[PDB]
Symmetry: C2
Subunit: 296 residues, 2 copies
Amino acid sequence: KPFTVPILTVEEMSNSRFPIPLEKLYTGPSSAFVVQPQNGRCTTDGVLLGTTQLSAVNICTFRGDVTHIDYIMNLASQNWNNYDPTEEIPAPLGTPDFVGKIQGMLTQTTREDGSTRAHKATVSTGSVHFTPKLGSVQYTTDDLQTGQNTKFTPVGVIQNHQNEPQQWVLPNYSGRTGHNVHLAPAVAPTFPGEQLLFFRSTMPGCSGYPNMNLDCLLPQEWVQHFYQEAAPAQSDVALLRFVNPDTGRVLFECKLHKSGYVTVAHTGPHDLVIPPNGYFRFDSWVNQFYTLAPMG
Amino acid sequence: KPFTVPILTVEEMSNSRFPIPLEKLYTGPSSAFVVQPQNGRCTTDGVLLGTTQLSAVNICTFRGDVTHIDYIMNLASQNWNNYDPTEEIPAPLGTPDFVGKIQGMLTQTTREDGSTRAHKATVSTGSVHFTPKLGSVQYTTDDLQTGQNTKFTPVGVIQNHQNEPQQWVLPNYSGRTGHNVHLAPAVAPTFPGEQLLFFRSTMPGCSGYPNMNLDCLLPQEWVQHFYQEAAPAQSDVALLRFVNPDTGRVLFECKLHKSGYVTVAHTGPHDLVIPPNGYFRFDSWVNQFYTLAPMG
């Protein structure tokens, strides 16, 4: 099958690491960071890696029952059935993949009356009570029956300023009980001139001076597209050109490594300047020795 | 181009009328209802109708500034730029398309300190202050600077029991100022044996005895797929067969009208029983006189 990327504009896409839309394109120096994101990890061939699942709305949500202590939720699977700690994944597909406090809201229904309730609730993925893999997560909930399906819908990050969140620091899915399992390989631009092309959004902040940025390596729909299509990597890198349908002109080119990350020939930071109508286009499969035309 | 539907299982898909995953397949009697949903309306040929946009995470969100009175938000566009009441759409793409109270949370950042805040907030789309089209929406917010980007993230519906929400009753996007503009055509099964095949989810409830169901005519990804693909309607109806990859057997067939709705040959209600691994498959283009093999 022939390879393609979706004709979606950045603003028409969604961040694969938090349920919010993409806002911009950005690139900066990697060196000092880790870049082990587990969400938004997909082989361009179609292979989902890490904790990556297809739904953009289920990223960072948690379902299950809860028991009052601030509150512990014995996790269930997205579809509300039993959690299987057996699978060979880092944690439930869609689990958060950075260390931080995520404010949201807990909601439950009592199968009995049609009765319902809702309360604010936060979750620190740094806390040693953040054990998704093992099957339980603790909410520092800022009246909650047991044996009743509870759901957590994420909203933003409530986080000395800018310190949290720690976007490139992976939480411990098994917490204290053990190291992380079956992680997606870490990313780093290898070629000389090149740097990494991120896909940034701004997680809403919910109280405090949090570092609201959030970069992802692949848009949620690229993940959804490689999954459907499953186009053979007729090469180890795919040359992408970011076109503009208004002027009909190419702005910059970039590298889509079949592994699942994007690199752009640039040194130093830069909030990528682009036309709201521009989108990426698959031109050709190239060797990893292909030097890219510099970026703006 | 040849027509297709995505190989996604119901649970792998998302509801196109609220940012939550699909849960089940359902069918019941239409007659007494309207069925004028504006979200999840797409021509199978690729034409988005009503207030339908591509992002499943931006359904029911509102951005803009707010001014304390409980609170009014002068709407902005998804990308945070000016709202254009000029476009020939019923309202901002993604606006809610049923009458009800939607609880969620308002969050804002103050460009100045990195300062942030968050408070619960509800919105009644029945209220005469619900004027999306005109550019303003009022929150009955259950400390909010002005001239500061505020966002509303929806969570569930806080709604004598079961009365609200009114899933098939369209809100007035211009409120009192005028009737609704450029609506997606209403739906109804025309053929004799047939009924309408919905795609149901359960909006979380956030306080009260709300009618948490929510049916949509097309999964958000079918909408995203017809948009990419844009496969010519070589006919006015497309025969779909819901297969099971485990047993390799067809369960039931259904009608995908190029208009953008699904009909199944059945009379009376029924929570469709299906294997978690089953998915739909495009078999052939047929005439509207094709009688369907009854459904379970």
